[PDB]
Write an enzyme that holds these catalytic residues in place. Structure first.
Site, short mmCIF file in Angstrom:
data_model
loop_
_atom_site.label_atom_id
_atom_site.label_comp_id
_atom_site.label_asym_id
_atom_site.label_seq_id
_atom_site.Cartn_x
_atom_site.Cartn_y
_atom_site.Cartn_z
N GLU A 1 71.89 42.60 23.66
CA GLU A 1 70.91 41.72 23.07
C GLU A 1 71.40 40.29 23.21
OE1 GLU A 1 67.79 40.69 22.08
OE2 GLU A 1 67.65 42.44 20.82
N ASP B 1 70.50 47.35 22.07
CA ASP B 1 71.30 46.27 21.53
C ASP B 1 72.78 46.14 21.98
OD1 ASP B 1 69.09 44.97 20.31
OD2 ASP B 1 69.13 46.37 18.68
N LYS C 1 61.79 53.30 15.04
CA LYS C 1 62.71 53.14 16.15
C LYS C 1 62.85 54.44 16.92
CE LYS C 1 64.46 48.95 16.23
NZ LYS C 1 63.98 48.01 17.26
C1 LIG Z 1 61.66 43.93 22.07
C2 LIG Z 1 61.08 42.87 21.13
C3 LIG Z 1 61.76 42.47 19.99
N1 LIG Z 1 61.21 41.52 19.16
C4 LIG Z 1 61.95 41.09 17.95
C5 LIG Z 1 61.81 42.05 16.77
C6 LIG Z 1 63.13 41.91 16.07
O1 LIG Z 1 62.88 40.96 15.04
C7 LIG Z 1 64.13 41.39 17.14
C8 LIG Z 1 65.03 42.50 17.71
O2 LIG Z 1 64.27 43.56 18.29
P1 LIG Z 1 64.95 44.99 18.61
O3 LIG Z 1 65.39 45.44 17.18
O4 LIG Z 1 63.92 45.85 19.31
O5 LIG Z 1 66.31 44.82 19.24
O6 LIG Z 1 63.36 40.93 18.26
C9 LIG Z 1 59.89 40.96 19.43
O7 LIG Z 1 59.34 40.11 18.69
N2 LIG Z 1 59.20 41.36 20.53
C10 LIG Z 1 59.74 42.27 21.35
O8 LIG Z 1 59.11 42.57 22.35
MN LIG Z 2 67.52 45.93 17.75
MN LIG Z 3 67.21 44.54 21.13
#
Ligand SMILES: Cc1cn([C@H]2C[C@H](O)[C@@H](COP(=O)(O)O)O2)c(=O)[nH]c1=O
Ligand SMILES: [Mn+2]
Ligand SMILES: [Mn+2]
Length: 178
Positions: A61, A89, A115
């Site tokens: 990430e 991540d 998730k």
């Molecule tokens: C993959 C993705 C994550 N995010 C945001 C949501 C969470 O607040 C942060 C991390 O996402 P993740 O938990 O999927 O790693 O990024 C978006 O706004 N749009 C997206 O397409």
């Molecule tokens: Mn995440």
């Molecule tokens: Mn992520």
């Protein structure tokens, strides 16, 4: 809230967060809660990575898309691990598995299910944290030691208190959507 984010998160995190939002056509100045959420998630990912021994984790990430995939593909090719459909991540060298980190304004169980639904081909480990000290991980395998987890939970609680001290928590708490 914009002032709060700029104030409580380091500049590297803020820049990455702004970049990610702009990539989706969103303005950090306007969708402030989202801005705060992205920053919080990034911070947790970084803290989690720093939890083990040096070299234990690889951070995925926060990298640009090309680099992130390069890391993921490289890991898969060398270790033989199955390739994920979406970017995770982190990668845990010791347990040899990818990790998906979630931070939620709602409840850990619902977020874990959300998730889990996305991964489907669940070879990826899932770890969820809340701002109230709760956590939920795949098979109750928490990966890090209690001291490390405690540090994250404490940071998150602190962020919540600070937001609350400014009357920003109510709106932030209610901005997460299924
Ligand atoms: C993959 C993705 C994550 N995010 C945001 C949501 C969470 O607040 C942060 C991390 O996402 P993740 O938990 O999927 O790693 O990024 C978006 O706004 N749009 C997206 O397409
Ligand atoms: Mn995440
Ligand atoms: Mn992520």
């Amino acid at each position: 809230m914009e002032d709060f984010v700029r104030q409580c998160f380091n500049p590297m995190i803020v820049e990455l967060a702004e970049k990610a939002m702009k990539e989706y056509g969103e303005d950090p100045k306007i969708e402030t809660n989202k801005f705060a959420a992205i920053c919080t998630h990034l911070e947790v990912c970084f803290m989690y990575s720093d939890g083990g021994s040096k070299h234990r984790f690889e951070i995925i990430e926060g990298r640009d898309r090309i680099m992130a995939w390069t890391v993921v593909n490289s890991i898969c090719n060398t270790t033989g691990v199955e390739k994920p459909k979406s970017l995770p991540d982190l990668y845990d060298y010791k347990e040899n598995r990818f990790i998906e980190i979630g931070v939620t304004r709602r409840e850990v169980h619902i977020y874990y299910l959300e998730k889990a639904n996305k991964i489907k081909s669940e070879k990826t480990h899932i770890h969820i944290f809340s701002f109230t000290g709760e956590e939920m991980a795949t098979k109750a395998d928490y990966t890090l030691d209690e001291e490390s987890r405690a540090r994250i939970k404490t940071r998150l609680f602190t962020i919540r208190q600070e937001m609350a001290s400014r009357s920003l928590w109510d709106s932030f708490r209610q901005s997460e959507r299924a």
